[PDB]
Design a protein around this motif. Structure first.
Motif, PDB file in Angstrom:
ATOM      1  N   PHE A 127     -45.086  17.231 -59.490  1.00  0.00           N
ATOM      2  CA  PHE A 127     -45.576  17.144 -60.918  1.00  0.00           C
ATOM      3  C   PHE A 127     -46.757  17.953 -60.645  1.00  0.00           C
ATOM      4  O   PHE A 127     -46.948  18.859 -61.843  1.00  0.00           O
ATOM      5  CB  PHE A 127     -46.131  15.881 -61.307  1.00  0.00           C
ATOM      6  CG  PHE A 127     -46.504  15.932 -62.865  1.00  0.00           C
ATOM      7  CD1 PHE A 127     -45.564  15.898 -63.916  1.00  0.00           C
ATOM      8  CD2 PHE A 127     -47.725  15.354 -63.115  1.00  0.00           C
ATOM      9  CE1 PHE A 127     -45.981  16.055 -65.224  1.00  0.00           C
ATOM     10  CE2 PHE A 127     -48.139  15.373 -64.525  1.00  0.00           C
ATOM     11  CZ  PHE A 127     -47.537  15.901 -65.401  1.00  0.00           C
ATOM     12  N   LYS A 152     -42.562  22.507 -65.391  1.00  0.00           N
ATOM     13  CA  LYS A 152     -42.879  21.271 -65.543  1.00  0.00           C
ATOM     14  C   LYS A 152     -42.791  20.918 -66.950  1.00  0.00           C
ATOM     15  O   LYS A 152     -42.532  19.663 -67.105  1.00  0.00           O
ATOM     16  CB  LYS A 152     -44.415  21.333 -65.091  1.00  0.00           C
ATOM     17  CG  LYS A 152     -45.144  20.088 -64.874  1.00  0.00           C
ATOM     18  CD  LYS A 152     -46.607  20.138 -64.937  1.00  0.00           C
ATOM     19  CE  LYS A 152     -47.280  18.905 -64.625  1.00  0.00           C
ATOM     20  NZ  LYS A 152     -48.695  19.087 -64.344  1.00  0.00           N
ATOM     21  N   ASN A 153     -43.045  21.608 -67.831  1.00  0.00           N
ATOM     22  CA  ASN A 153     -43.289  21.268 -69.507  1.00  0.00           C
ATOM     23  C   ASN A 153     -42.029  21.509 -69.863  1.00  0.00           C
ATOM     24  O   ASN A 153     -41.951  21.492 -71.268  1.00  0.00           O
ATOM     25  CB  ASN A 153     -44.482  22.174 -70.127  1.00  0.00           C
ATOM     26  CG  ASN A 153     -44.062  23.694 -70.024  1.00  0.00           C
ATOM     27  OD1 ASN A 153     -43.141  23.949 -69.389  1.00  0.00           O
ATOM     28  ND2 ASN A 153     -44.932  24.713 -70.623  1.00  0.00           N
ATOM     29  N   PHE A 158     -39.701  24.023 -70.371  1.00  0.00           N
ATOM     30  CA  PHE A 158     -39.545  25.374 -70.909  1.00  0.00           C
ATOM     31  C   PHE A 158     -38.844  26.037 -69.924  1.00  0.00           C
ATOM     32  O   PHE A 158     -38.300  25.934 -68.666  1.00  0.00           O
ATOM     33  CB  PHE A 158     -40.837  26.108 -70.941  1.00  0.00           C
ATOM     34  CG  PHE A 158     -41.727  25.876 -72.338  1.00  0.00           C
ATOM     35  CD1 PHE A 158     -42.065  24.642 -72.679  1.00  0.00           C
ATOM     36  CD2 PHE A 158     -41.724  27.203 -73.170  1.00  0.00           C
ATOM     37  CE1 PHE A 158     -42.846  24.496 -73.781  1.00  0.00           C
ATOM     38  CE2 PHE A 158     -42.287  26.836 -74.558  1.00  0.00           C
ATOM     39  CZ  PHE A 158     -42.957  25.482 -74.822  1.00  0.00           C
ATOM     40  N   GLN A 211     -38.962  26.124 -75.221  1.00  0.00           N
ATOM     41  CA  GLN A 211     -38.778  25.062 -74.865  1.00  0.00           C
ATOM     42  C   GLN A 211     -37.055  24.573 -75.025  1.00  0.00           C
ATOM     43  O   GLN A 211     -36.537  24.863 -75.913  1.00  0.00           O
ATOM     44  CB  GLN A 211     -39.610  24.152 -75.734  1.00  0.00           C
ATOM     45  CG  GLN A 211     -39.641  22.723 -75.100  1.00  0.00           C
ATOM     46  CD  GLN A 211     -40.824  21.774 -75.090  1.00  0.00           C
ATOM     47  OE1 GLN A 211     -41.638  22.253 -75.884  1.00  0.00           O
ATOM     48  NE2 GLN A 211     -40.887  20.683 -74.726  1.00  0.00           N
ATOM     49  N   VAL A 212     -36.830  23.835 -73.842  1.00  0.00           N
ATOM     50  CA  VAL A 212     -35.358  23.384 -73.768  1.00  0.00           C
ATOM     51  C   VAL A 212     -35.100  22.018 -73.343  1.00  0.00           C
ATOM     52  O   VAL A 212     -34.133  21.540 -73.650  1.00  0.00           O
ATOM     53  CB  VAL A 212     -34.367  24.226 -73.003  1.00  0.00           C
ATOM     54  CG1 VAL A 212     -33.138  24.022 -72.804  1.00  0.00           C
ATOM     55  CG2 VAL A 212     -34.619  25.630 -73.569  1.00  0.00           C
ATOM     56  N   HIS A 213     -36.238  21.432 -72.670  1.00  0.00           N
ATOM     57  CA  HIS A 213     -36.254  20.107 -72.263  1.00  0.00           C
ATOM     58  C   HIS A 213     -37.496  19.229 -72.787  1.00  0.00           C
ATOM     59  O   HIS A 213     -38.695  20.029 -73.100  1.00  0.00           O
ATOM     60  CB  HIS A 213     -36.021  20.071 -70.625  1.00  0.00           C
ATOM     61  CG  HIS A 213     -34.581  19.919 -70.422  1.00  0.00           C
ATOM     62  ND1 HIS A 213     -33.809  18.969 -70.518  1.00  0.00           N
ATOM     63  CD2 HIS A 213     -33.725  21.159 -69.804  1.00  0.00           C
ATOM     64  CE1 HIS A 213     -32.546  19.463 -69.896  1.00  0.00           C
ATOM     65  NE2 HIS A 213     -32.664  20.710 -69.728  1.00  0.00           N
ATOM     66  N   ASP A 214     -37.639  18.133 -72.583  1.00  0.00           N
ATOM     67  CA  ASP A 214     -38.704  17.065 -72.912  1.00  0.00           C
ATOM     68  C   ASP A 214     -39.486  17.076 -71.953  1.00  0.00           C
ATOM     69  O   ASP A 214     -40.763  16.471 -71.945  1.00  0.00           O
ATOM     70  CB  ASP A 214     -38.230  15.830 -73.218  1.00  0.00           C
ATOM     71  CG  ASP A 214     -37.160  15.640 -74.614  1.00  0.00           C
ATOM     72  OD1 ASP A 214     -37.655  16.171 -75.433  1.00  0.00           O
ATOM     73  OD2 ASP A 214     -36.223  15.017 -74.472  1.00  0.00           O
ATOM     74  N   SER A 215     -39.003  17.001 -70.635  1.00  0.00           N
ATOM     75  CA  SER A 215     -39.772  16.949 -69.391  1.00  0.00           C
ATOM     76  C   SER A 215     -39.345  17.760 -68.161  1.00  0.00           C
ATOM     77  O   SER A 215     -38.425  18.665 -68.374  1.00  0.00           O
ATOM     78  CB  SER A 215     -39.705  15.611 -68.936  1.00  0.00           C
ATOM     79  OG  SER A 215     -38.435  14.963 -68.741  1.00  0.00           O
ATOM     80  N   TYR A 216     -39.762  17.523 -67.114  1.00  0.00           N
ATOM     81  CA  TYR A 216     -39.459  18.450 -65.860  1.00  0.00           C
ATOM     82  C   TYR A 216     -38.000  18.804 -65.533  1.00  0.00           C
ATOM     83  O   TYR A 216     -37.244  18.040 -65.357  1.00  0.00           O
ATOM     84  CB  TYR A 216     -39.892  17.776 -64.492  1.00  0.00           C
ATOM     85  CG  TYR A 216     -40.023  18.392 -63.248  1.00  0.00           C
ATOM     86  CD1 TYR A 216     -39.016  18.733 -62.478  1.00  0.00           C
ATOM     87  CD2 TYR A 216     -41.222  18.784 -62.845  1.00  0.00           C
ATOM     88  CE1 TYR A 216     -39.019  19.337 -61.274  1.00  0.00           C
ATOM     89  CE2 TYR A 216     -41.356  19.402 -61.527  1.00  0.00           C
ATOM     90  CZ  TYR A 216     -40.453  19.725 -60.904  1.00  0.00           C
ATOM     91  OH  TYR A 216     -40.696  20.672 -59.614  1.00  0.00           O
ATOM     92  N   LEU A 276     -35.228  20.037 -63.592  1.00  0.00           N
ATOM     93  CA  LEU A 276     -35.003  19.891 -61.946  1.00  0.00           C
ATOM     94  C   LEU A 276     -34.382  21.042 -61.308  1.00  0.00           C
ATOM     95  O   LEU A 276     -34.494  21.478 -60.286  1.00  0.00           O
ATOM     96  CB  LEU A 276     -34.191  18.561 -61.758  1.00  0.00           C
ATOM     97  CG  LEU A 276     -34.990  17.408 -61.950  1.00  0.00           C
ATOM     98  CD1 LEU A 276     -34.021  16.138 -62.198  1.00  0.00           C
ATOM     99  CD2 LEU A 276     -35.923  16.869 -61.032  1.00  0.00           C
ATOM    100  N   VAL A 289     -35.314  15.661 -65.826  1.00  0.00           N
ATOM    101  CA  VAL A 289     -35.859  13.993 -65.966  1.00  0.00           C
ATOM    102  C   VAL A 289     -35.459  13.369 -67.277  1.00  0.00           C
ATOM    103  O   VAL A 289     -35.124  12.137 -67.175  1.00  0.00           O
ATOM    104  CB  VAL A 289     -37.326  14.184 -65.425  1.00  0.00           C
ATOM    105  CG1 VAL A 289     -37.726  12.596 -65.538  1.00  0.00           C
ATOM    106  CG2 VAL A 289     -37.486  14.389 -64.095  1.00  0.00           C
ATOM    107  N   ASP A 290     -35.618  14.051 -68.355  1.00  0.00           N
ATOM    108  CA  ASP A 290     -34.917  13.542 -69.608  1.00  0.00           C
ATOM    109  C   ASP A 290     -33.362  13.230 -69.545  1.00  0.00           C
ATOM    110  O   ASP A 290     -32.760  12.583 -70.401  1.00  0.00           O
ATOM    111  CB  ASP A 290     -35.426  14.379 -70.711  1.00  0.00           C
ATOM    112  CG  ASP A 290     -34.764  15.789 -70.865  1.00  0.00           C
ATOM    113  OD1 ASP A 290     -33.502  16.075 -70.418  1.00  0.00           O
ATOM    114  OD2 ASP A 290     -35.506  16.710 -71.164  1.00  0.00           O
TER     115      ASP A 290
END
Lengths: 309, 585, 518
Positions: free
Chosen positions: C178, C287-288, C290, C307-312, C314, C333-334
């Motif tokens: 993180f 991390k954000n 993006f 932005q493409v995801h809500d969280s990390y 992977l 992780v979403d």
């Protein structure tokens, strides 16, 4: 209800509270601002405003036995010109006041990470609220819990889930094979697979023809051409565990007398002596479980407990 | 002045962080929520009580999609039919007409009237030419431009709308891409006579597009480049576009180029303040916002218009969800849109922690913030119905700028006698009719006396054609309320409903606008447009003036004449008092 | 037909045209792969991957498409290093002191840092290759490739291993994903002969960039002074490219790095994974949630930041093709798995699935069959074609999470490692290119090896015994906990024609293992 009149009452009520401290949830409950979410919002805003304007201070108080069980309280400062009622916990010594101002490892699977912290936390175990908060933080509690159900187990790296109670909050507690060891009061090797055929036999004999699909032949021009035509309780267990070690730390024998009840209370860590009936209940349970032998001294009438070995 | 309380949209989701909010001509909000659109349907109420919920009611808008690229195998775009279950990806309302166009996930553009599909746009060509990525509405006339995967700006234009459902038909296509190139259209903007379009390789073309020209000059204003165009707008003929770390300003009067660094890589939305004296834009992003004055030179200045409110809300939220400053937090903007009159802005957003979030549909929610962009405002000829009321409420009820000679009240001069259906059109196209419609939203008792004078003058001129009984009854009713002489006629009118028939002396229609008494001694109230007795269980209700209108599509017994048939066919949906859509039962 | 779920594609020819299209030159490769590998259930003929084979098929990754060294690096950006002594190397990088007790069939050994062990003779056949001990947590492995037309000996090949100074503890303040964390970690670069399996540790590189993953060699970074160039994401949140400058000797050297040839970084955000879209541009995640495409020639500002995801995020992976757009896939992780085209994300974004939120999700591209291969974050291996996202075919089921996956550009053989220490091989082409009807019996998998451990005996107990697992289609996800060191951390085939039957895998204790499948 017009909250603008009540700000003076909120400061005077906190001013009149024991040692100038009041739990915010209990303060809401006294003024009956708990009847509607409309009243709740008004109250939380008022407490925040009194904190920002420096009439009160938001402070935490931490359970001396549990860093995750902390109480949101207001402290009095000057005159005007997580939801469990903790008025139970505030009765203890509870002196851990604090005035207000993520471990997730990518490379090892989540299973092994909850196991490692459940092991490192020792014989006292760890609560699910500690595990989620330290590994992934509060937001991931959903995906964590939907994952833990596939590997935590009811009562060789197995994890056991057990209920617990503190204050008025009921929560699950995690323990590793350490629990099995301390309930008994770690597996060795395992067999190799004993399958002995050559991989060439498996790559030959395991083949089965697949459905007809796109295929080809090479023309006289050297050109590649297609053909597709034709194709019983935690406190009692902890106390029974203690009573063996509290005997064994003295010797193979002890007397069931005042200074023994004091020693059981002192090794357990209580600020006051446990009631004799509570200790005798667990002594009787472990005597009946044959962990302890017991008898009367024939020249005094006092009671002896001993290790049968 | 304080802003209205935010509209709290609950249980809705968005599939991507693009601009998802559009706001139609009638004041209807459209949010491209996943999997179904959420419409902020407009409603009327005088006791708004500082809450935006009293203006907009939110409901799911489950359209149905059919896919013309189904059966047809995907080529150089591998994703084309990758998810065969369609959902809406873009949604824009008409700026002058009254339709909605939507880009499906598989790249069709389909056009709709309320929940009913009108037509699915198609033209001959290869599979990529039939697949669309962006579309825009002509700001002046009934036509639409669509950008395809071949790099062609294709035109469709609209006819048959007076007789039957509007025909959308294929007209022509400018190939904006280089010969045999694989780049495709991504953005189109169309302001007055100038169209500007951007291809995937960031090449941008500006051209004058008009019915008078067959040969538009596709002048490329920005060469193919590395940096992606995040947003594109036309602002007083200056083109404005933004890329990571930069804002580019171009003047189409001479085709000159200029630039300024934005100082951040967060996506910037371009908000053009069209009504300002000097061409000016607000730039908005999830972390910062500022005002760029677009003179000959560029500038950086305070976003005093919008930023102070967002900062207050963000501090308020932080006080509860980040009280220790433990987490990095962001203001995620899912969409921003100007009101159809351009005097207000709507921002759809949520405040969030950067963390290991695993969200679910039931926990998701968004706030829509409505805010005034200026200190003064006026009616606009584009916006209609509740759109005027929305701006009035957003400006804390501050009245619009009325004409100094007209501050009913004005009843402007009308030296006209045009063909009857068009006469009602010309009548509603007049500035004096628009200010009357807005005034009805403010006064204690609505009125339409100015409009009635236009129908009186028409009936008095057309005396040789007022042969029908119902038509005469309508005229007599207008004459009597207006205190101008009633045309000479005699006898009894007959009116019917599905079970009962009533005879009325034409003289029984007194000058009273409220009621009429039948020859059988039964009393009845008058209709809000034709003034006839309301005898049927099929009237539409005006949500502003509470008046009733007879649905001419439902009546099958009354022998209406040309004046009565023509009146009702022209007001069967739009209110004569306020331009709002009438409610139906 | 209303072709909208996988069961609608009942006809075998209908499946192939629906999943792969009608481009005649694309369909040739599928016919070649089918005939060249239908009988290759668990192993394939060496003669089929050779450059002259009647069934030869090879799709080069986008980074190899043109020479990149003069654009990505050149003499203006040479990597800054200095040589060091073994005493200071061991002062920072405290690689494991105590020896590990391996068992391999009948043989015991106590194995120190660097002790190569050839496979002893085993009852189930002629095992060829070696076990090793790299001495700390192997976080990633990466095989280099050399064009066989070059003057370099066709049998010499190179491999790199990224190694933590941290050990068999799976929860540590220092392996946090993180937040930004610079610390000492290293790369061991190995030279080996595919002919004799003889191997030497050539260079050890020390850097403060923290742990390293998503490690790959840039196959276009050619210059006479370089072995190659080595690219990775690091726990300091940047992408670092460094020059593997060749020695004048086979003797070992220890190095420390002061400045890598090219560092990609962004304000207040940590880069988490990356892939090449061309010889000079990379897609990367943050991390954000993006996604951005950086230009290796112009690293100052990204081409886009959306932005493409809500969280990390992977893992990110590129599905290159000679006939379709270069689509990119991402998982976070979403739990969403999204496929999109970098030309325009907003107009093209598509969903394959939502998983349970899982903190390691291996995703790879199998270029021989145009299909992504992924772990469902729980315990199944699945294939999805880039142009038919709904056509998800499950390949294999395991009792514990699939933690590493590997695939090659010359053959369709997929290797998957579960955190129970099991390593399985399966032919993905047999699932993708053939009918749906008899899938529960016509597709099978083989266990090539299994690690095991005893809490009381403290051995690592590698079992050579082969086990066949048939495809359980309707199967439940499972999560059996197992010993910390026995989980598989990486697995990759060498992809040269000479080395194409060779693969490497690692557990988390340090027991890197290689085999030549002959």
């Amino acid at each position: 209800i017009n909250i603008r009149d009540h700000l003076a009452t909120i400061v005077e009520v906190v001013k009149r509270s024991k040692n100038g401290i009041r739990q915010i949830i209990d303060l809401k409950r006294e003024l009956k601002f708990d009847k509607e979410k409309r009243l709740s919002k008004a109250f939380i805003a008022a407490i925040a405003w009194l904190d920002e304007k420096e009439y009160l201070k938001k402070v935490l108080v931490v359970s001396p036995k549990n860093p995750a069980i902390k109480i949101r309280c207001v402290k009095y400062v000057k005159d005007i010109p997580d939801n469990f009622n903790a008025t139970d916990l505030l009765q203890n010594q509870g002196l851990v006041m604090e005035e207000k101002e993520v471990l997730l490892n990518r490379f090892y699977p989540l299973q092994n990470q909850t196991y490692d912290i459940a092991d490192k936390s020792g014989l006292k175990g760890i609560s699910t609220m500690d595990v989620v908060n330290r590994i992934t933080g509060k937001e991931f509690q959903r995906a964590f819990t939907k994952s833990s159900e596939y590997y935590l187990e009811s009562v060789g790296y197995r994890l056991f889930r057990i209920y617990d109670f503190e204050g008025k909050k009921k929560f699950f507690r995690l323990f590793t094979a350490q629990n099995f060891q301390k309930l008994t009061n770690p597996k060795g090797f395992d067999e190799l697979g004993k399958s002995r055929t050559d991989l060439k036999t498996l790559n030959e004999d395991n083949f089965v023809a697949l459905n007809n699909t796109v295929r080809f032949t090479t023309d006289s021009d050297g050109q590649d051409i297609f053909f597709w035509h034709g194709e019983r309780s935690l406190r009692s267990l902890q106390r029974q565990r203690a009573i063996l070690k509290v005997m064994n730390t003295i010797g193979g024998v002890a007397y069931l007398r005042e200074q023994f009840y004091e020693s059981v209370s002192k090794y357990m860590g209580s600020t006051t002596t446990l009631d004799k009936k509570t200790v005798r209940g667990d002594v009787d349970l472990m005597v009946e479980s044959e962990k302890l032998g017991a008898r009367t001294e024939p020249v005094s009438g006092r009671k002896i407990i001993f290790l049968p070995t | 002045m304080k802003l209205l309380k935010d509209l709290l949209v609950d249980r809705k989701e968005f599939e991507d962080w693009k601009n998802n909010l559009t706001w139609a001509r009638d004041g209807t909000l459209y949010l491209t929520t996943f999997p179904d659109i959420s419409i902020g349907q407009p409603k009327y109420a005088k006791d708004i009580n500082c809450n935006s919920k009293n203006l907009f009611h939110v409901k799911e808008f489950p359209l149905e999609f059919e896919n013309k690229l189904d059966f047809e195998l995907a080529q150089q775009n591998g994703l084309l039919n990758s998810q065969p279950v369609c959902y809406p990806r873009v949604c824009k309302p008409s700026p002058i007409d009254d339709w909605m166009a939507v880009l499906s996930n598989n790249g069709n553009v389909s056009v709709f009237k309320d929940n009913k599909m009108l037509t699915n746009l198609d033209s001959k060509g290869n599979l990529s030419s039939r697949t669309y990525h962006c579309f825009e509405w002509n700001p002046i006339e009934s036509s639409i431009v669509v950008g395809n995967e071949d790099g062609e700006l294709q035109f469709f234009s609209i006819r048959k709308n007076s007789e039957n459902t509007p025909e959308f038909y294929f007209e022509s296509s400018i190939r904006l891409s280089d010969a045999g190139s694989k780049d495709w259209v991504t953005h189109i903007v169309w302001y007055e006579d100038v169209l500007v379009a951007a291809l995937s390789n960031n090449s941008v073309f500006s051209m004058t597009v008009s019915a008078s020209s067959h040969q538009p000059v596709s002048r490329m204003i920005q060469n193919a480049s590395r940096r992606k165009i995040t947003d594109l707008k036309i602002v007083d003929y200056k083109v404005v576009l933004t890329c990571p770390g930069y804002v580019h300003k171009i003047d189409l009067k001479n085709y000159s180029i200029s630039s300024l660094k934005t100082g951040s890589l967060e996506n910037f939305h371009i908000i053009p303040l069209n009504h300002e004296k000097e061409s000016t834009i607000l730039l908005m992003s999830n972390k910062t916002s500022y005002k760029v004055l677009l003179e000959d030179e560029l500038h950086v200045t305070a976003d005093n218009i919008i930023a102070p409110y967002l900062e207050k809300k963000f501090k308020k939220w932080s006080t509860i969800w980040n009280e220790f400053n433990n987490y990095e937090t962001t203001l995620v903007i899912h969409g921003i849109s100007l009101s159809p009159d351009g005097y207000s802005i709507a921002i759809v957003y949520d405040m969030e922690r950067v963390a290991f979030k695993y969200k679910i549909a039931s926990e998701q929610s968004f706030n829509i913030m409505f805010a005034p962009l200026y200190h003064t405002w006026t009616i606009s000829e584009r916006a209609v119905g509740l759109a005027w009321y929305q701006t009035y409420q957003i400006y804390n009820q501050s009245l619009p700028k009325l004409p100094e000679n007209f501050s009913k009240l004005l009843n402007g001069n009308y030296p006209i006698s045009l063909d009857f259906q068009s006469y009602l059109n010309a009548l509603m196209k007049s500035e004096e009719m628009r200010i009357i419609m807005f005034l009805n939203m403010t006064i204690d008792k609505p009125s339409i006396l100015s409009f009635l004078e236009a129908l009186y003058e028409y009936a008095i001129n057309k005396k040789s054609e007022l042969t029908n009984s119902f038509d005469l009854a309508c005229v007599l009713s207008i004459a009597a309320i207006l205190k101008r002489e009633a045309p000479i006629y005699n006898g009894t009118l007959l009116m019917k409903n599905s079970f009962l028939e009533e005879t009325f002396n034409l003289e029984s229609f007194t000058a009273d606008p409220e009621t009429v008494t039948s020859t059988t001694n039964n009393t009845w109230k008058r209709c809000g447009v034709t003034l006839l007795p309301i005898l049927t269980t099929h009237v539409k209700i005006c949500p502003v003036s509470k008046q009733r209108v007879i649905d001419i599509k439902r009546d099958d017994l009354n022998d209406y004449g040309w004046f009565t048939r023509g009146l009702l066919e022209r007001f069967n949906e739009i209110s004569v008092y306020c331009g709002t859509t009438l409610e139906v039962m | 037909r209303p072709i909208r779920l996988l069961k609608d594609l009942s006809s075998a020819r209908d499946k192939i045209e629906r999943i792969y299209g009608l481009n005649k030159e694309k369909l040739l490769l599928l016919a070649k792969v089918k005939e060249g590998f239908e009988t290759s259930v668990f192993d394939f003929p060496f003669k089929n991957i050779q450059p002259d084979s009647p069934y030869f098929v090879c799709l080069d990754p986008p980074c190899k498409k043109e020479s990149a060294y003069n654009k990505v690096i050149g003499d203006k950006n040479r990597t800054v290093y200095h040589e060091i002594n073994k005493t200071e190397f061991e002062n920072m990088i405290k690689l494991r002191t105590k020896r590990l007790k391996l068992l391999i069939g009948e043989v015991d050994a106590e194995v120190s840092t660097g002790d190569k062990i050839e496979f002893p003779v085993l009852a189930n056949g002629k095992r060829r290759g070696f076990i090793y001990n790299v001495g700390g947590l192997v976080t990633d492995i990466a095989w280099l490739n050399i064009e066989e037309n070059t003057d370099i000996g066709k049998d010499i090949q190179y491999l790199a291993v990224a190694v933590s100074q941290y050990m068999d503890e799976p929860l540590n303040e220092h392996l946090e994903m993180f937040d930004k964390e610079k610390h000492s970690s290293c790369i061991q670069i190995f030279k080996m002969n595919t002919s004799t399996l003889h191997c030497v540790k050539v260079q050890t590189i020390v850097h403060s960039f923290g742990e390293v993953w998503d490690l790959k060699w840039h196959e276009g970074c050619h210059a006479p002074h370089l072995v190659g160039c080595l690219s990775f994401v690091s726990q300091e949140g940047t992408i670092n490219f460094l020059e593997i400058i060749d020695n004048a000797t086979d003797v070992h050297v220890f190095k420390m790095c002061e400045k890598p040839s090219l560092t990609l970084s962004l304000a207040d955000s940590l880069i988490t994974t990356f892939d090449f879209l061309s010889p000079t541009t990379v897609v990367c995640g943050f991390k954000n949630g993006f996604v951005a495409e950086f230009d290796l020639t112009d690293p100052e500002v990204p081409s886009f930041y959306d932005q493409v995801h809500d969280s990390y995020i992977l893992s990110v992976s590129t599905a290159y093709s000679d006939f379709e757009d270069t689509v990119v896939s991402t998982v976070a992780v979403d739990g969403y798995f999204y496929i999109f085209n970098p030309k325009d994300i907003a107009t093209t974004k598509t969903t394959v699935s939502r998983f349970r939120g899982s903190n390691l999700v291996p995703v790879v591209y199998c270029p021989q069959i145009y299909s992504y291969i992924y772990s469902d974050g729980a315990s199944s291996l699945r294939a999805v074609p880039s142009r038919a996202a709904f056509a998800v075919h499950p390949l294999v089921s395991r009792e514990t999470t699939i933690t590493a996956i590997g695939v090659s550009r010359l053959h369709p053989m997929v290797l998957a490692g579960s955190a129970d220490g099991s390593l399985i091989i399966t032919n993905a082409a047999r699932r993708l290119l053939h009918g749906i009807k008899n899938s529960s019996a016509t597709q099978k998998s083989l266990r090539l090896w299994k690690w095991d451990y005893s809490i009381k005996d403290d051995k690592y107990r590698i079992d050579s015994s082969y086990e066949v697992y048939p495809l359980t289609v309707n199967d439940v996800s499972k999560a059996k906990i197992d010993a910390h060191g026995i989980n598989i951390t990486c697995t990759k085939w060498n992809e040269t024609s000479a080395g194409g039957k060779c693969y490497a895998f690692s557990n988390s204790a340090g027991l890197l293992t290689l085999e030549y499948l002959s």
